[PDB]
């Protein structure tokens with residue numbers, strides 16, 4: 001509880017330090033997420049579906065890789081701070097928590113901006129996503145960011161070891 | 164002519180140093196480019212007006228963003244070597260060349276990989292022609308070049324008195 | 325506390341930094357580690373910290389064999405040691421206060437205690453006015469003193485200094501040595517690797533000389 | 541060559557590193573720069589190289605006013621100077637040979653000339669057998685000597701060394717000083733900031749003392 005607030009402030013301090021890099025990172029996630037949402041809603045409002053069942057999996061695969069790539073390159077620029085904390089004598093979990101939260105908020109921010117884009121498209125030219133669908137999308141994107149951050153941080157962790 | 168080879172060798176060294184990171188960087192650009200490929204294939208074979216124009220711009224807006232962001236972060240990781248080389252007395256053009264060639268190569272590999280993925284889908288279940296393939300490769304290379312130029316130029320204005 | 329038994333170290337490539345190093349340092353003892361460039365002093369200090377692993381022999385720290393420590397108990401070893409590095413290994417994105425306070429945050433101290441102890445540690449090395457700056461806005465000697473203050477904040481049992489007086493003039497070097505002696509007067513072990521004879525000639529301590537990875 | 545007229549330097553925040561420094565150095569002259577930690581030595585050296593811009597006064601390098609240089613002429617100034625840094629500023633992803641040879645490549649020399657000159661320069665600092673290694677595989681003194689070799693490979697008009705003797709013992713410090721004197725014997729200006737009173741005591745050169753940004 002005491003260390004949770006310290007990690008949470010550590011994640012926002014990084015994101016606020018480079019607003020342009022973060023905003024450009026999030027803007028990619030929103031664009032890559034707004035397409036599946038329009039395609040889902042146009043099909044929901046309205047045998048050819050089986051011919052696109054092998055193509056619907058394609059758009060969802062992009063968002064796994066975009067967020068995973070986005071968090072990976074963020075931790076790489078900070079791979080020096082990982083080494084310093086390991087030298088002082090920090091445990092693996094202590095280093096991990098700042099990075100897990102920053103990835104989760106990165107995916108959450110992109111999904112939140114994705115929903116705003118989808119609504120604007122609807123107003124231009126039918127009903128949009130429901131509250132449950134929006135919450136599910138936000139949760140899934142947050143989990144994707146969390147898993148990607150964990151993978152990247154653990155990969156960089158087993159590098160500064162005595163071996 | 165004497166510095167083109169040295170710039171080219173440094174571009175490959177940065178990409179080859181981390182094959183796992185570079186390939187994943189390539190892999191995302193390939194996935195994003197596959198969507199316009201199949202959609203253009205279906206529309207070409209089959210053939211609302213205002214129900215796909217806003218979609219069409221949506222995918223093309225992605226490739227600019229995915230390529231630009233990938234080059235943005237790769238240069239940020241190596242921004243220390245820009246400062247060191249600037250202290251010695253290298254000009255802007257000398258520093259810029261290795262980063263420009265890395266940007267063009269990064270898009271070229273991604274566009275070439277998306278061509279293979281689109282070909283697999285046709286084989287799995289008529290498609291793009293040689294001219295369209297060349298056009299897509301050239302467009303992706305041009306986007307990568309511009310992204311690398313922008314990122315490196317913004318990094319050069321930081322390390323100044 | 326510290327024991328070396330036929331310690332050898334060879335890096336990946338065949339460059340043997342050490343060859344058959346063996347010695348013993350009782351608790352609270354102070355000593356100097358000297359040698360030429362490339363002798364292998366920083367390798368010895370890192371082998372003490374568990375950053376590197378010896379290729380032969382055994383290393384004992386506080387009576388516990390740390391030759392083959394698992395990755396899970398390494399932080400508990402490194403918490404008792406106050407290590408000063410040669411490149412100062414700072415966090416450039418955090419203030420001087422956060423840099424000096426991170427050992428206490430890892431330890432789990434209270435806010436008032438952290439404030440008091442960080443203020444005292446910064447006051448020892450003459451960097452109390454420089455608590456809000458970032459390491460970029462400091463000098464090389466000031467950054468080295470930031471590293472020193474970070475090292476002496478958590479009350480370690482063993483001090484490992486990796487040339488802590490370079491970038492510091494003779495007055496500051498004498499002050500830092502006096503600070504280390506003050507810490508050694510309360511039972512703390514100190515091992516200071518350096519190659520300035522002017523500082524070490526005026527105090528009679530144990531002498532450890534390294535020549536191509538050989539101990540005398 | 542080097543001329544200062546009422547130069548001042550104040551950083552962002554109101555910290556004045558220099559105040560009213562004025563001096564002059566004739567071509568081929570050798571001198572020392574000393575002071576306490578935080579005195580303002582590296583700021584002076586950076587002001588010579590054009591890395592920093594003076595807040596007041598004027599600076600002349602080889603008779604050309606460089607107090608307001610355009611960004612298109614900075615490389616042409618910095619190609620004439622061999623600068624040694626306190627952090628050694630190496631490229632960690634390239635070998636020692638590439639690090640030493642990059643000034644020649646920027647200048648535009650041929651392959652065989654690069655081979656010969658870089659081998660000679662690496663032999664001057666005693667690092668010829670380490671030409672293929674990476675800077676991670678080097679000690680602190682060896683990395684400092686790699687920076688020195690990079691500095692003295694392009695036959696400069698001015699040498700700006702900032703404590704190139706820390707991490708080096710007395711014998712290697714003496715050798716580096718003799719190397720600098722060998723370069724000064726052909727008309728190279730040397731201005732060396734140092735913390736070593738013993739090293740400068742046995743040779744009689746010009747002395748420049750700095751205290752809180754003031755020259756004596």
Ligand SMILES: Nc1ncnc2c1ncn2[C@@H]1O[C@H](COP(=O)(O)OP(=O)(O)OP(=O)(O)O)[C@@H](O)[C@H]1O
Nearest residue numbers: 335341361362363364365366367676677679680681
């Ligand atoms: N990462 C590394 N990989 C391989 N060899 C290394 C590495 N770091 C240092 N060495 C080598 O190990 C030997 C000992 O280096 P070390 O830095 O421990 O010596 P040192 O005497 O403390 O140096 P200095 O006086 O310059 O600080 C030298 O041959 C050095 O070049």
Ligand SMILES: Nc1ncnc2c1ncn2[C@@H]1O[C@H](COP(=O)(O)OP(=O)(O)OP(=O)(O)O)[C@@H](O)[C@H]1O
Nearest residue numbers: 460461463464465551557577578579580581582583
């Ligand atoms: N980047 C910076 N921004 C602001 N102030 C700085 C910066 N770097 C140094 N200073 C300050 O400028 C003054 C002079 O520092 P400088 O490093 O030039 O002195 P120095 O005598 O060469 O130091 P040292 O002896 O420790 O190597 C000090 O007050 C220092 O803290």
